[model samples]
Target: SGEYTEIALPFSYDGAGEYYWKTDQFSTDPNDWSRYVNSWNLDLLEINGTDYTNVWVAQHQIPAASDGYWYIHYKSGVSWGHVEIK
Candidate 1:
C-alpha cells in the first residue's frame, strides 16, 4: 500500500443532524456524508495548498491556508467539529 498521510475523523451518530458535501463530480447530497455509521481513518495523499475549507472525503482537496497536515473529527451523525491536524 505505500506511505500516505493520515486524515482521521472522529464520528458519532445523531438522527436529526444535517451534513453536506460533494460526493463526486455529480453528487452533492447531504445523505452522502451521512452514510458513514462511525468514525473514519483516512490516508491523505497530498495537500494542494492551505485550503482545508473544502477538503473532500473521497480523496484529497485543496487547503485554504498555510501548508500543514489536516484531519477532521465528526462529532455525531453528520455534525462535525474538533478537527485536529499537525
Candidate 2:
C-alpha cells in the first residue's frame, strides 16, 4: 500500500471555487523539482481547460511548507497541480 491520493489536473470547475488540497507531500526544496515533476507518470504535466493550455517546458514552483502547491506555467496564463509524496 502507498500513502497517496488521486487528484484531477486542469481542475474542472463544477460550480465550486474551493479546491481542498493536501500539503503533507510538498517539497519546499526546489532541488527536488525533477522528482515531483515526473513522478507517478505525473512528471510530464500541463493543462488546458476553461482558459488554460500548456507552453514549452512548464516551470515548476514549489511552494512554502504549508497548504500550498505548484503554481505551474501555461500559455494563456498560470495554473497548479501536485504529486502526493508516495
Candidate 3:
C-alpha cells in the first residue's frame, strides 16, 4: 500500500468561499499568468462550514521528507499554505 500524509492547513476567509489548489507545473498560454496555474487533485475536509476561519485537511500522497507549499486560490486572493511531511 502507498503511504499518505495528512495535510491540515487552516485558512481565514472573508465569507463562505471556495478554495482550489494551484501549482505552477502546468501552463497553457506562456503570455498569460492565469494559464500557468493548475490545481492539485485535493479533497478539502471542512472543519467549520459557517465560520469565519475554516480549517481543512487535504490528504496527499507524497514522498517522505518532500518539501513544498500548497497554494490555495480563493475568491479574494491566493494563500500559500505550508505542507507538513508526516
Candidate 4:
C-alpha cells in the first residue's frame, strides 16, 4: 500500500509586470454592489503594482454593472475594475 495526497497550484506572475486578482468571497453590503445598471454610478479602478489586495478606489473612471445579487468584493486592482455579467 502507498499513500500520496498532495497538490500544488502554480500561480505565476511573469516575474515582473502588472498583476490583479478578484475576491473569492461574497458580501451583503449595499455599498459593495451596484445593480440594474442604466447609468454611470460613479465608479473607479486601481493599478496595483504589488501582490496583494488594496482596499482603495485607486481611480475614478466610469460606472460599472451589477446583477443585483449578493455581491462578491472583486479584487481587480490592476489599473481598472471588473464586472461579472449574469
TM-score winner = 2
Worst 10 residues of 1 by lDDT: 18-27
For model 4, how does the per-residue alpha-carbon lDDT over 3-76 read when each residue is reduced to its tens digit? 22222221112122222333212333455443211111113223122211323221121222253222122233
> Model 2: per-residue lDDT, tens digit, 24-54?
3334455544433321212222311111222
Query: What is the TM-score (0 to 1) of candidate 2?
Result: 0.25
Estimate TM-scores for all models: 0.20, 0.25, 0.20, 0.18
- State each model's CA lDDT, in order: 0.28, 0.29, 0.28, 0.25
Segments in model 3 whose C-alpha atoms lie over 4 Å from true places? 1-9, 16-57, 61-67, 76-86
lDDT of 2: 0.29
lDDT of 3 by residue, 18-71 (tens): 544433232223354332112222223222122212232222321112234333
Which residue pairs show backbone clashes in model 2? Answer: 37-43, 38-43
Off by over 4 Å in 2: 1-19, 37-60, 65-86
Give the clash count for each candidate.
8, 2, 0, 2
